[PDB]
Amino acid sequence: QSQLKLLVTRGKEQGYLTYAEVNDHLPEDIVDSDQIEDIIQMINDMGIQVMGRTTDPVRMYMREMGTVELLTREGEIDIAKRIEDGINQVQCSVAEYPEAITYLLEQYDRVEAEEARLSDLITGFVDDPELAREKFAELRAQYVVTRDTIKATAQEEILKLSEVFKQFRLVPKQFDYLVNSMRVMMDRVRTQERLIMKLCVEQCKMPKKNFITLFTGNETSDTWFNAAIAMNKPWSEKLHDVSEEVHRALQKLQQIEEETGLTIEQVKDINRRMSIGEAKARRAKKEMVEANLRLVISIAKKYTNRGLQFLDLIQEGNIGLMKAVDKFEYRRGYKFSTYATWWIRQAITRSIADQARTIRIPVHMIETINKLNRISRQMLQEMGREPTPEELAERMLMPEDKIRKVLKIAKEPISMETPIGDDEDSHLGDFIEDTTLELPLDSATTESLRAATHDVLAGLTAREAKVLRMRFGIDMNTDYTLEEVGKQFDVTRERIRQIEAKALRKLRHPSRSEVLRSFLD
């Protein structure tokens, strides 16, 4: 029951505290400068020092993942089941979209027309170029049979269309683009819907209760528009003012029913269904990862000192675990533990191979270095001192002259702030000389040489000076070709080339040449 005594007690038992900790606990009556700055002196006379949540995320992450309940052998099957139920739902949602099929057919029309490759359009269906060329025709056939049924008999063929479209394993990029296209189309639908909506409720003064009444099921026709406004309602006669805008913007709304080959009613349903599926999927998968977060740490504890931080390792490893959850199928019976282990380890190793170096080197380089490091172990005490630098790669399958270069670039650069001898503020980089700088003496000699050469060029004839300056970059930008010189000089060719040699001779004699001679040091 004292504030000060608490401050000093912490600062006595520990002995040792920081400015902030002292500022945290201060007498009720001390808020100001001399009332603290002196209290420090008071404290720094006895027990002298001056300078839950522990911060460092190594803790917080460990605790936050420490919450998550470990799975059960059967629970994994539950979650994976939720996954299966989730995904293939959005796959079916894709298969029920006409533009999704037509896009595939058109892109394949581009494939056979040599405007693109197969690898970009497919990974193979349930599995050959010929088999592909045929199976694709099967798909096209099941499309062209359902295309003419648009007239209650079509719901039967649409099933089989979905079936054959589902048999295709699309390139992930393409599938992504398809889903994107669908959702974007939905966003357009919402553009028109909201535009029409705000011209009634937000402007024209009319309830959303009555607005959606005749809206659902048509929205394209004038049943809710031309057959409505005459109804003698308080919100009815107000609809005349904007009646132009809505009717003009309705065209695109019914145009979507053409482009997508689906009524506005159906579109929203399909895309919403797909959203539900996707959400379900991710919802299960995350839950799968969070349970296995421990394995990642257990693996990462091996790779600690390789030049990456602990949390970096566990995060890259977490990404690996995510990949494992994405590519895993419980139907194969493979234990998820021993499976995902390799994935996490792979992500870790592959990442360390990359970002642990100031100068990043290719993977095969790292491996090639590793092998040499291993060979140099066995011959260490075997040779009595160490194997000669030119005896390593003999056992390696390469020209063997690499050992030098490989041993050279591999060494990491030394910290420029590394303390050098004398233990003073002297640091390594402080002794790094600037070579790229042009010393002032030389920079002066250059100016003097400019003036000198100018003077020597002032002695020749006007045309000799002009042509000799033109042959070089003297007092001009971009020294000109011997033909160009003539082009500017009128008379051309072998003429100019002569004057050059005629100038040099006149400047060769130790009268005009003696001045700049000493520059030849």
Added chain:
Amino acid sequence: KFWATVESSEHSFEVPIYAETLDEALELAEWQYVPAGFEVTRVRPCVAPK
């Protein structure tokens, strides 16, 4: 306020102690000083002709 003269260690100094009475100022000083191992020497009222 009241300036309380506290002396400890190698040297001394005065710290402001707010209170409604000289006696109260002394009590609030000691309660907020003595237990830390700091000696309470003097207590003075703040003058300041105004």
Added chain:
Amino acid sequence: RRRKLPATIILRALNYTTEQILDLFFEKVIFEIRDNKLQMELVPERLRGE
């Protein structure tokens, strides 16, 4: 240089109950209730400085 702890802890960590600790650094003054209203065993040297 670590944080301060009560000395007796280092004894308890050596597996010594409170009795054993008190049975080391302190002598014993025996009290007898023989007959009634106690009594005390007295070593004449104990009376020094009191």
